[PDB]
Amino acid sequence: SSNRWLVGQGGTYYVSVTCRFATTGGTPPTYMDVLLFVGLSPTGVENFVIRQQ
Amino acid sequence: SSNRWLVGQGGTYYVSVTCRFATTGGTPPTYMDVLLFVGLSPTGVENFVIRQQ
């Protein structure tokens, strides 16, 4: 659906994720830190994949 | 070819790209920013994949 994936058959899956973070409007900040997660919950945090600054 | 792929059959393709950008000679600059695209033309920017710095 618009935000979530319902799995049809459980098993081994090759998951690929990509997303670009930017800033719009005003004075850009001096820094950000970013974490990407995949979860079974709206706050699901079980598979943390990549963090960049 | 030397710089391009001819699609034999249209469909879904899992493509991976990797390019290492560095500097040679002189005084190294203070900043690099590179954007990568998958295009249908030599000047094409149809599928922007990653911008990094």
Q: Which residues of B touch A20 (CB under 8 A)?
A: 50-51
Residue pair B37/B46 in contact (Cβ under 8 Å)? The answer is yes
* Resolution for this PDB entry, in angstroms: 2.6
Distance in angstroms (rounded) separating the CA atoms of residues A23 and B15: 28
CB contact under 8 A, A20 and B49: no
User: Which phi and psi angles does B22 have, rounded to 5°?
Assistant: -140, 180
CB pairs under 8 A between A and B: 5
Residue pair B37/B48 in contact (Cβ under 8 Å)? The answer is yes
Chain A residues whose C-beta sits inside 8 Å of any chain B C-beta: 16, 18, 20
Q: Which residues of B touch A18 (CB under 8 A)?
A: 49-50
Of B35, B39, B38, the C-alpha closest to B51 is: B35
Please give the single-letter amino acid code of residue B6: L
Per residue, the 3-state secondary structure of chain A, as one string, reads CCCCCCCCCCCCCCCCCCCCCCCCCCCCCCCCCEEEEECCCCCCCCEEEEEEC
